[model samples]
Target: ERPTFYRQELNKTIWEVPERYQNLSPVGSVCAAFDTKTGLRVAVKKLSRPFQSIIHAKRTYRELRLLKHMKHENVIGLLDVFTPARSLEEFNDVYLVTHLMGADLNNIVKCQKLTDDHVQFLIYQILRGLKYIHSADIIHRDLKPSNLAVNEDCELKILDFGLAVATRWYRAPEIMLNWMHYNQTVDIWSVGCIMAELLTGRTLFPGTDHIDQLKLILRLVGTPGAELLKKISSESARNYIQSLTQMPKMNFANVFIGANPLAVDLLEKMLVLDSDKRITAAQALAHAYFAQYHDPDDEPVADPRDQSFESRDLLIDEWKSLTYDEVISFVPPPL
Candidate 1:
């Protein structure tokens, strides 16, 4: 029987969770709790039906692996990992512990008015985290305001790495075009959309449908040229782009009137139609827009390693064993 409040005991510590965070996706449920040993408040996420399918199992493995490996101030810290089941025969649930923050950027944008410095620092931290992730050949793929966590000090941390579909508003044009192969550049586009939203206090591309999404992007960035169109793998997507009425790129100054010119310039570089032409995270951090906060020493990089499972299609049982082993063997870092 499920209790009104969830309680778990492990590692000689008891975590009493009283409130589940609101509006979490179906993939997992997040709750707020405090450890009895240290009284440290943390967020606990219980993976839902993790072994239900091969896909689910693989996602769980990937998420857990990344969380363990990715350690940075701008990235969510994985405090601990555990399971209620005592043995592999009964293993079913997986819980992850992390530091709890005040609110996500979605709520912050709606409730608070962020100043120019706030926006600059927020964007800086995102690119900082992204550079590290990209260094390991990992792409966040899904980056939106809601996935970004922030606190009272304006410290931000990027979270959620389950290869889930990104929210449509923050989805890059390449994905919308049905491009079979995309790269980290897709993440840069999402950041551009987010920066615009922070500046304007609304979604940059509030498209209702796939077709409308492209139109909204082109409306601001202008249509792709012939050279770029040749790169689109999908015939239908190519034809659709060709069929659209040519839209001249809107001037950023005109759109974000009285905004910082450097900010506008950075936005233009990030929102380019061709992913190849978009600014890389490394290059973006060096831009004048973040000059005040930029520091080469502070930004860290991840060691390059082969992620074989990213491409391999393993059986359900194999994935289950891998995921279970990862949890059972995990050793939390020293406090």
Candidate 2:
């Protein structure tokens, strides 16, 4: 039985942030083993060295607790939680235990080797998982590609809540304007941006700073004019419109290049300038697109712009794609 697998820690922390983020690894930076007694290998999560009594600790705990409560095939499971020394005196170091998954969607897209079907399948799963989390009143807040992936069961697993908020990307005018009452619809918006990135192999915003981020959203979704702003946006949100309406317009076609209607329609719903009228995750899930889907091919595509190569050239820049739409087409009826 090959020893039936077992849990073994290589050091105070077996894998550091560098490893967990896959910054230094070619494949998914995940490695785990089955307990000798249980005979099922699990994913291991590296936690931070907590030294503060801030909300960060509570939030981390909340995420762990949420993962514990939410056990689904598409969702990564929280198998266990532990501390290396179990005391504040022990460098405040800790790590989490969970089930192993394949490479994440972000890496698959940015790594520049995934085929069209692979991209399509991943986006469908993102929608599926988001539909589930939203049903529980849990807004992912951070619905980027890096947070999404398929596990051993080929189900999508959403991760990382450090910056999760009711609104994810700053696409909605209210969100762009700094209004923070964004609800679950925010994740919906991110999916739209992600879809575009998957196709273009570029970030939707890719702004160097906040102002640029604002400009990026306003350009594609269009500015909510004064009337639409007052009727559909919050006062704070409306104020954002007033300030930006006079600004120069940004053209979406330029950024997306050959954007498609299905992609645009979905992105439009999720990325409307008004947060109030944005698409709900349930509505998105029920959309004809995701049903009748197929799995991403098992074959691995080779990436020419590997990080190892990128590191050799200083001027070359790289980013993980925020994929969602263009790659995914509704499987069509009667499939």
Candidate 3:
């Protein structure tokens, strides 16, 4: 007999989950389950066909590797990894366990009315998490409202470190221009977009497509100068920008009218068109906007050497084997 919501037997443990979480995504599913042994609730993510392709296998390995090594207050923690398969031939599915939060920022933004204090502390935590991640030489690459999980108390945690892409609204300008070399500053750009969204309960740039995404971004930040435009690797992208009638950068104070002046100041620094001028996570943490909440000792950094896998390109079989080893080696924490 099969279980109604989720697989009843995952490895040797049993889970009680709901049907709503079963329809999360086509490639994977996130089900909130109750662990009978530890009496804890965790989100069990089942990655479908994780080893089906080289990219898929490598992404799975990278996420697991980073999550295992990263330990921070504002970043999601990997609690356990398990597979029912007893042999390599049967190891096709991977299950990741993590603490289940009440809702993501998408839900919170829609349901709750966030005060200026709420927005300030939330952005501070994001930068704090980014500091640790960048220290490890890892870029989140994806940071949006939905990827941030929160509870009733307003404590937030960043989630979804995998290569799963989302909307273009929060993407950095350099990424859209096809710049050959990008860095952690891309993440700061995302935080800027996220901050704007939080200030107003809506997306900062709701573009329809790739070209429109650039149009929306340039509309707000204004067109880049010729010197900055020359940095773009794509000739067509550079020409397209040069051809458009330039618009003056919008006054952020006017755009985010009535917002905290310090908050708007930080947003201006973060939303720079040039990635080189964008504020680093460390600098953003020290900005005056977070004066009430900033704590240098509380912010942590990861050892870059620990993330050597970011430079590696292993075969699918190797990735599969390494992921399998990680899953099997997990020793659950004591209750």
Off by over 4 Å in 1: 1-28, 53-59, 163-166, 306-319
Sequence-dependent TM-score of model 3: 0.84
Error of 2 at 125 (Å): 0.8
lDDT of 3 by residue, 1-335 (tens): 22134446444344434332342322236666655545556677777678888888888887777777767878887776777676898778777777777888788889788889989988998898889888987888888889898877778888868633359889897788788777899999999999899889899998888888988998899987776557658777677767877788999999998899999999999999877799999999999989999889888898655556666888889889988998877665444
> Measured by TM-score, how close is model 1 to the native structure?
0.84
Question: Candidate 2 lDDT, tens digit per residue, 11-125?
Answer: 4435432122222211233445443334444555555533244444444434444454554445555554443342233334444555455677677676766444555666676
Window of ten residues with lowest summed lDDT in model 2: 318-327
Q: By summed lDDT, which 10 consecutive residues of candidate 1 come out lowest?
A: 19-28
Write out the backbone clash pairs for model 3: none
Predicted candidate 1 versus true structure: per-residue lDDT over 61-164, tens digit per residue: 88788777877888877787777666787777787877777788899899888877889999999999899888877878789999899887778998867522
Every model's Cα RMSD, please? 5.3, 14.8, 4.9
TM-score of each: 0.84, 0.61, 0.84
Name model 2 segments beyond 4 Å from true: 1-63, 82-95, 111-119, 151-154, 162-173, 227-241, 245-261, 294-335
How does each model score on lDDT? Answer: 0.80, 0.51, 0.79
Clashing pairs in 2: 34-41, 43-98, 43-99, 43-100, 194-322, 194-323, 194-324, 195-324, 195-325
* Candidate 2 structure, TM-score to reference: 0.61
